Amino acid sequence: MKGILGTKIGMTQIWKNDRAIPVTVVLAGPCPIVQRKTAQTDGYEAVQIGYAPKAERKVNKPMQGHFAKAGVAPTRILREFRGFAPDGDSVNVDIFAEGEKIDATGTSKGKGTQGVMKRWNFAGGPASHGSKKWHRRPGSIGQRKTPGRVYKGKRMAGHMGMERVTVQNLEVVEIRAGENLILVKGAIPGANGGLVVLRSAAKAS
């Protein structure tokens, strides 16, 4: 249910009581409501809010129409959340309480194309026992004539990164509302200045 948008600002050291907590600083700036999707409107229950501000001079006629219909003023980013309401618009105030466990989604830093070691954790090869250009390669890719083919899904070199990743049960250390900042324990995927969606827990714990 609960959810909001913001940007990953960075990681830092703070102390609650006497242990050094590592904290990721998130800015969940205010989100306007824009679209409210219901059953008889769209089939399914959801709300579409928006995050980063955007000047008119950069906004499509159709997009302007969109935003204008709910009179909101325009945003570089829209996203949906299944099963959500209140009224007005949405700041991380109230929406999160300190101590509450949340789920943080982002887009992992992308690594480009990566061999089987870096990508999958292959074992590599003998750096020295006569190994002949087989230091980093993935060994064998199959059996023999049964089944004369290569398994579908077989892990091998490829585009590692730039993927959507959700970390579960991160703990809301601090909330400075009206700076729209959530101090969150641990680590969120994706680089500084990246987009993150924060959510209630998926799990009860």
Partner RNA sequence: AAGGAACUUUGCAAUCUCACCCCGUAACUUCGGAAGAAGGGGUCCCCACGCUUCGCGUGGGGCGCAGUGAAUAGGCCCAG
Partner RNA sequence: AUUCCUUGUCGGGUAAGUUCCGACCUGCACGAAAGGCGUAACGAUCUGGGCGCUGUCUCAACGAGGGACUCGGUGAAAUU
Partner RNA sequence: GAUGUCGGCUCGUCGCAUCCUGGGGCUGAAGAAGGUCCCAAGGGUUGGGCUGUUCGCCCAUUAAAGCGGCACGCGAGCUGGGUUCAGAACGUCGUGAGACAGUUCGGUCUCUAUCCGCUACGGGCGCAGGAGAAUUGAGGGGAGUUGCUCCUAGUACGAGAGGACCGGAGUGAACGGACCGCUGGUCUCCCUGCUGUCGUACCAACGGCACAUGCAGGGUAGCUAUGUCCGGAACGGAUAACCGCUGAAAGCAUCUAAGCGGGAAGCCAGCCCCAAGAUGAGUUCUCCCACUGUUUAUCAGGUAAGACUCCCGGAAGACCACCGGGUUAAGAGGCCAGGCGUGCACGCAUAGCAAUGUGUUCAGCGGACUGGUGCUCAUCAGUCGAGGUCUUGACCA
Which residues sit at the interface with another protein, rule CB under 8 A?
Answer: 6-7, 9-10, 12-15, 17-20, 23, 25, 27, 29, 51-53, 76-77, 107, 174, 176, 179, 181, 183, 190-195
In degrees and rounded to multiples of 5, residue 125 shows phi and psi of -150, 165
Least distance in angstroms from the C-beta of 69 to another protein = 24
Q: Residue 19: how many CB atoms within 10 A of its CB?
A: 6
Which residues are registered as beta bridge partners of 20?
15
Phi-psi region of 8 (alpha: psi -120 to 50; beta: other; left: phi over 0): beta
Give the DSSP letter of residue 53: B
Q: Which of residues 41-100 bind RNA (CB under 7 A)?
A: 41-44, 46, 48, 55, 57-58, 60-66, 69, 76, 78-80, 82
- Contact residue for RNA among 1, 22, 94, 176 (CB under 7 A): 22
Tell me: does residue 176 bind RNA (CB under 7 A): no
Which residues are registered as beta bridge partners of 34?
none
Number of residues that bind Mg ion (CB under 5 A): 2
Q: Which does 176 bind (CB under 5 to 8 A by kind): Mg ion, RNA, another protein, none?
A: another protein
Which residues are registered as beta bridge partners of 10?
25
- The answer to whether 12 touches 25, Cβ cutoff 8 Å, is yes
Tell me: does residue 124 bind Mg ion (CB under 5 A): yes
Least distance in angstroms from the C-beta of 7 to RNA = 8
